[PDB]
């Protein structure tokens, strides 16, 4: 009672499902990358900034 086009629509739906997850996952990955970036940077700058000051 329902066409092959609506099955196709369901396929398109699951594709949309996939794209949404794809987007969420990439965003999660980039956000953690930025967090690791900032964490390592802060550690390094604090370490050396302190040593320079101490020397002076």
């Amino acid at each position: 009672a329902l066409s092959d086009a609506d099955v196709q629509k369901q396929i398109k739906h699951m594709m949309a499902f996939i794209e949404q997850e794809a987007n969420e996952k990439a965003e999660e990955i980039d956000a953690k990358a930025e967090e690791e970036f900032n964490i390592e940077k802060g550690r390094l700058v604090q370490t050396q900034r302190l040593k320079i000051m101490e020397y002076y």
């Binding site: 329902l2 609506d6 099955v7 629509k9 369901q10 739906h13 699951m14 499902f17 996939i18």
Partner: protein, 750 residues
């Protein structure tokens, strides 16, 4: 237009996991689709329902434990509610554990209660206490005392103590007055000795009595603690009772909830797990008829779920042999089952059941054509139907009653037709039904026909009533004239009818069964099965066996008593027909030109054999070489069909002599069982006759049921069914299929 199996369609359904829980739930309750296991090498662990099944099993064991305790408590749990809710939330997992905690509490209650009982069982003894006398069940105080005497006889004084209106003994839970003769010693070696002796005996030596009132004060204190204990027991029991009633209310709901969730989990394991998507796709076969119903069901299921996945059934063309689905109802289901008992029909095979509904009761009624017993049989079926609601809504552990109940609508017809045939047979416990229409002969005219004072010689003779005396004749309006039920030669008149009738009916049913095959061969577009099969097959059977039937009717209307001497013999002409035996004399012919007809029909029947024997394999071989086919094997298959068909036709026609054999036997048992049992209950003495008939009748009714209503009905039941299985169905109802087992909410009565 014949009834056939329903169409189902195999599809691949792709359901998102969350949606999948909802969909399986809804579709399982809807019940019109069947899933296949796509990964037979994969276990439940592999399907990932192992946690689901183990959880269900734990809940099940807990439920069964509680249920048992509930039954022990005689709680009136109904389990008649909750049927349509089918919850399937994930939260149930934790709630089931909470159910277990409830049950765990009862064990603890029982644990404390028994412990409490033992102290109670013990403490009562102190009240009876308030030399150390014991308390015994008094069953063996005779030997208790004598055996203690002999430890050192007469060494210490006997202490006599008795308890009236006692409590139940803790070991036996039995209340019984105590009458105990005790030996108590001051010496340590002997006290130790008697301790050993009295303890070996079933005796309780719990207290150590003392003269000082301090011990009495102690007992008073214990008595107080004992009353407190009783009050605690009363509290523990009240909680126990409250919790158990609460469990009966929850447990009726949970039985279903858990049973259903588990079933859902089973199906979920009954799936193929995809890799690219967290979605399961399955091959599911569902009736085309229900295709809209299922699509709407998919919509409802997935609509409840938040993911709103389309949940589309993906229709596909699968060679995979579909299951055989026959829609039945409360009446026809039983008839379908007696067919299925022999086998599942080929997909789109002609269903014999729509015709069995009448055909089988009819053939039974022929075997069991007994007016009186048909009533008894009908009333039994009526009882079961009138109690149908009460029989369903109860437990029926007796499989014998369940069987006849399941067939109760089959039996109903069996009785109704048995009444019809019994009336025509005009036999109700060997008694005919005289409607004052019996005009077979006019006895007054018998005397006119040169029989003057024949009753003088009659004192030693019977004398057979002549045919065509000019004063006798005329058929009975309905059934056999009652006069034959009192004849000494009924054993030829009536037996002749049943033999000839059995042949007539059997052959007609055989011809019908063959006719049905034409519709099936046309449906499957097998021209060869009708051009080389049906046509020569139906001619074969008609030319030999239908001819016989015609001649039987012919004689009945062609020859009268005027030609009874040297009257044609139907069996002899039939045999001589096949053998082309045409003697000049010794047998009268039925009609002029019969010889030519007899020869013609046999030749044609033999000429029919090549058609069915060799034309199909030969033409198929031709088509192979023309189009460009296992020719040898095809010849084997067709030859077997031809050989079995022709030889079976001969045997099958004779087989229907079952109708005669069973009908004859029943009539003979009825006549003798009547004559040698109930007749004996009658006597010329008035009161003695009545009192005797009372007891004799009861025995008569007993034998009629034990021998005829049950056993002969039972044998005729099977034999009529066999006729369908062997001779009728094998003409058209061929091949095998699979039983259709869709998702269904079967466990409703449980």
């Amino acid at each position: 237009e014949l009834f056939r199996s329903e169409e189902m369609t195999l599809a691949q359904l792709f359901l998102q996991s969350e949606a999948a829980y909802c969909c399986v739930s809804e579709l399982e309750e809807l019940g019109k689709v069947q899933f296949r296991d796509l990964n037979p090498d994969v276990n439940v662990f592999q399907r990932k329902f192992v946690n689901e099944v183990r959880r269900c099993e734990e809940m099940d064991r807990k439920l069964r434990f509680v249920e048992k305790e509930i039954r022990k408590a005689n709680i009136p749990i109904m389990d008649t509610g909750e049927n349509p809710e089918v919850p399937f939330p994930r939260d149930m997992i934790d709630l089931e554990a909470n159910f277990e905690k409830i049950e765990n509490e009862l064990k603890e209650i029982n644990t404390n209660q028994e412990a409490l009982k033992r102290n109670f069982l013990e403490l009562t003894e102190l009240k009876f206490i308030l030399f150390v006398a014991g308390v015994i069940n008094r069953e063996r105080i005779p030997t208790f005392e004598r055996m203690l005497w002999r430890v050192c006889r007469g060494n210490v004084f006997l202490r006599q103590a008795e308890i009236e209106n006692p409590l139940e003994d803790p070991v036996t839970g039995d209340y019984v007055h105590k009458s105990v003769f005790i030996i108590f010693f001051q010496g340590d070696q002997l006290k130790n000795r008697v301790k050993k002796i009295c303890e070996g005996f079933r005796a309780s030596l719990y207290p150590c009595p003392e003269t000082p009132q301090e011990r009495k004060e102690m007992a008073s204190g214990v008595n107080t603690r004992i009353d407190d204990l009783q009050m605690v027991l009363n509290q523990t029991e009240d909680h126990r009772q409250r919790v158990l009633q609460a469990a009966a209310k929850n447990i009726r709901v949970w039985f279903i909830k858990v049973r259903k969730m588990k079933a859902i989990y089973h199906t979920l394991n009954l799936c193929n797990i995809d890799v690219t998507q967290k979605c399961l796709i399955a091959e599911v076969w569902c009736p085309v008829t229900d295709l809209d119903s299922i699509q709407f069901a998919l919509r409802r299921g997935t609509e409840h779920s938040g993911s709103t996945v389309p949940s589309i059934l993906n229709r596909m063309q699968t060679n995979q042999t579909p299951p055989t689905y026959n829609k039945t109802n409360k009446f026809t289901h039983g008839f379908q089952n007696i067919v299925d008992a022999y086998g599942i029909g080929t997909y789109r095979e002609i269903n014999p059941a729509p015709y069995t509904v009448i055909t089988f009761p009819f053939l039974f009624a022929v075997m069991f054509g007994d007016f009186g017993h048909g009533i008894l049989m009908t009333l039994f079926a009526v009882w079961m139907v009138l109690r149908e609601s009460r029989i369903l809504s109860q437990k029926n552990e007796n499989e014998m009653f369940s069987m006849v109940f399941s067939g109760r609508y089959i039996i109903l017809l069996m009785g109704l037709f048995s009444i019809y045939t019994g009336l025509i047979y005009n036999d109700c416990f060997s008694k005919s039904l005289n409607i004052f229409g019996s005009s077979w002969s006019v006895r007054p005219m018998f005397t006119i026909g040169n029989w003057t004072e024949e009753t003088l010689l009659g004192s030693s003779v019977l004398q057979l009533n002549p045919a065509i005396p000019g004063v006798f004749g005329g058929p009975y309006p309905f059934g056999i004239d009652p006069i034959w039920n009192i004849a000494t030669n009924k054993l030829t008149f009536l037996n002749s009818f049943k033999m000839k009738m059995s042949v007539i009916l059997g052959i007609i049913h055989m011809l019908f069964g063959v006719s049905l095959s034409l519709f099936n061969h046309i449906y499957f577009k097998k021209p060869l099965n009708i051009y080389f099969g049906f046509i020569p097959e139906i001619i074969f059977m008609s030319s030999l066996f239908g001819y016989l039937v015609i001649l039987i009717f012919y004689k009945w209307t062609a020859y009268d008593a005027h030609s009874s001497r040297n009257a044609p013999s139907l069996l002899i002409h039939f045999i001589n027909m096949f053998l082309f035996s045409y003697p000049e004399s010794g047998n009268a012919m039925l009609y002029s030109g019969q010889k030519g007809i007899q020869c013609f029909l046999i030749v044609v029947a033999m000429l029919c054999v090549p058609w069915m024997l060799l034309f199909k394999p030969l033409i198929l071989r031709h088509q192979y070489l023309r189009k460009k086919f296992d020719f040898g094997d095809t010849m084997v298959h067709q030859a077997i069909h031809t050989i079995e068909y022709c030889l079976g036709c001969i045997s099958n026609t004779a087989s229907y002599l079952r109708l005669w054999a069973l009908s004859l036997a029943h009539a003979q048992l009825s006549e003798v069982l009547w004559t040698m049992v109930i007749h004996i209950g009658l006597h010329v003495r008035s009161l003695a006759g009545g009192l005797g008939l009372f007891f004799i009748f009861a025995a008569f009714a007993t034998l009629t049921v034990a021998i005829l209503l049950i056993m002969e009905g039972l044998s005729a039941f099977l034999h009529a069914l066999r006729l369908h299985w062997v001779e009728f169905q094998n003409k058209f109802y061929t091949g095998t299929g699979f039983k259709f087992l869709p998702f269904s909410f079967e466990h409703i009565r449980e």
